[PDB]
Amino acid sequence: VLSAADKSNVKAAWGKVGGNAGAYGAEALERMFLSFPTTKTYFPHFDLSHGSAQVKGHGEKVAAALTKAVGHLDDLPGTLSDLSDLHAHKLRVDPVNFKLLSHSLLVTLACHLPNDFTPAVHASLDKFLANVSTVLTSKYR
Amino acid sequence: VLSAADKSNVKAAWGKVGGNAGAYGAEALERMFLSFPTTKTYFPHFDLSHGSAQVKGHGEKVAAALTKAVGHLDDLPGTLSDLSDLHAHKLRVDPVNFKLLSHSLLVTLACHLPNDFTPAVHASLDKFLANVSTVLTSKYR
Amino acid sequence: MLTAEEKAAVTGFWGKVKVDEVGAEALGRLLVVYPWTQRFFEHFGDLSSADAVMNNAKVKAHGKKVLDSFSNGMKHLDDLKGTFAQLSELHCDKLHVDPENFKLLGNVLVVVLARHHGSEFTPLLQAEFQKVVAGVANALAHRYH
Amino acid sequence: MLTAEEKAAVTGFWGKVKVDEVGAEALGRLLVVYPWTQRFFEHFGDLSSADAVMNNAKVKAHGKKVLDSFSNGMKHLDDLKGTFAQLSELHCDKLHVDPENFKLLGNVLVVVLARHHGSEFTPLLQAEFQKVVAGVANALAHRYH
């Protein structure tokens, strides 16, 4: 589980992100689509060229979900439940894909917040996203 | 994070296992060492040859842990917490290796339960093993 | 790949294999145990329960096609990369199956072999097939390199 | 591997990378973020906290060794396999590092390039480096097939 130091690191890291959550979400998605093209095939109804309205709208929503998680660290299984239903039962996301969005987010955060992204913040953020994915892959098993 | 027909299947399938758990623990371990030789490194102090008392002993205690798990399908995080601490903090078992033991077990089970290993039972057990595995990777500093 | 002895052990054992039904059972068990893979198999019909998958005619038929190309590979152990080059293009570029799933199907087939052949399917023999299914995994994944 | 223009995009970026320091940091972050990897480096002394790992002089020395072999790969991108022959044999037939961990260090390194270079390390440039680390991962893993 996330330690009290993790909880402060994550909250603080996401604090800096602040208003820019949505932009970073859209960037993370784009870094995921390009770097791992298989992931594109979950979004065949999207126009996935750089700057597209649908990627931008989706990025805003992924961001809002992670912001909501950052408020509720002592309960990620609970507050993300309804999302684990969607991803697994409806969309059927291969469980391997989640680590990819996680990686892409880390690269995004690192790009924009170099002086915040110490090794220990890197670590707690990874832990935070490992926690999220897990919940999101919950509804297999 | 399981079912109920699952729980019934798991107990039932563990039932027909019986006093053979200890012996099926050792076989699976052997199947893991042979099929996946990098798992041998966790046991440099073991005689790893077929029939060895060291494998036997260890197979027992593996089987006995799972026997306990079947007993507590409603609180796997709580009941297996100590083992998880052990595997991660002391043993540093690469989380990738849990998959390979589970598969080795199923193979073992299937070798001895041909008319008691239906798709449905396969799913249930694999689900159970995955719950078990998830708990044993859950502490990671 | 497999040494002179290994090729011959695996091959002797494969003559025993009821390949058609192992094919159907492996793919069926794939869809039940790892629900997500159904996403590639929507158009096959009702895959909404164990009973559904296991009595789905097209799952049976496709199972056989899958295991047939696998048994072809069993005759091309030295050239798996080559044997599977067209299918690698199909799975990678058209279907976009993540190469992990080649391993899950491999593993699942191994379970099915285990269920059909019991204690004749020795630790050593299984280990030999683990290499074979890992080889098949590679050749299938290769055009992602 | 890459096309003759992709290779150029990559070589053009890498000439700006300070490999020694990316190396020290990348191995560092790996050990902090993914603790099970520490097992392979117990003989490097104290690794008991983030600061301990990051200031470990041998972790920094080794970091550089890992990145220098990287840079070297960059110079032999058409033949990554043959170039990593000995190290593929070292990690597998001796160190028994599971191939998965190659991918991880690769990703940690790409995280470090992002931190070191910011918006210069574009999505497009990243994807190019993403298949380099995959390629390096394949060559170090190879001895397992």
Ligand code: HEM
């Ligand atoms: C960090 C973990 C993730 C979070 C927080 C997240 C968040 C979300 C949210 C909030 C939605 C709802 C969108 C809506 O209500 O319209 C959604 C939908 C969706 N997600 Fe995720 N997601 C994550 C990971 C992934 C991954 C890794 C994939 C696969 C690459 C994926 C694929 C999809 C798809 C295809 C949709 C439906 C798109 C649409 O029709 O708008 N998700 N996700």
Ligand code: HEM
């Ligand atoms: C379902 C999965 C597993 C269960 C239930 C399990 C359970 C156990 C138990 C009961 C012990 C012995 C504690 C004692 O001596 O009383 C143990 C120890 C150990 N485990 Fe696991 N384990 C699992 C998976 C793994 C895996 C996947 C690995 C790595 C390949 C691993 C590596 C080890 C090692 C090296 C020891 C210490 C051996 C000794 O000194 O006797 N375990 N585990």
Ligand code: HEM
């Ligand atoms: C051992 C690994 C595998 C082998 C040997 C294999 C082999 C084959 C073969 C022979 C075909 C038929 C080509 C034809 O009809 O000419 C096929 C098609 C197909 N494969 Fe695989 N395959 C493997 C893994 C997978 C996996 C793991 C998936 C899903 C995750 C998959 C998804 C598909 C799909 C969706 C089709 C076409 C289905 C249709 O539209 O009728 N394959 N494969």
Ligand code: HEM
């Ligand atoms: C792209 C990934 C990697 C590359 C390019 C790489 C490269 C190298 C190089 C150049 C050496 C030194 C060769 C020598 O002096 O003989 C080395 C040694 C070593 N590597 Fe790696 N490596 C990688 C990943 C890993 C990973 C993921 C681990 C484990 C998590 C690991 C564990 C070790 C260990 C324990 C040594 C020897 C340390 C010692 O001598 O005390 N390596 N590697």
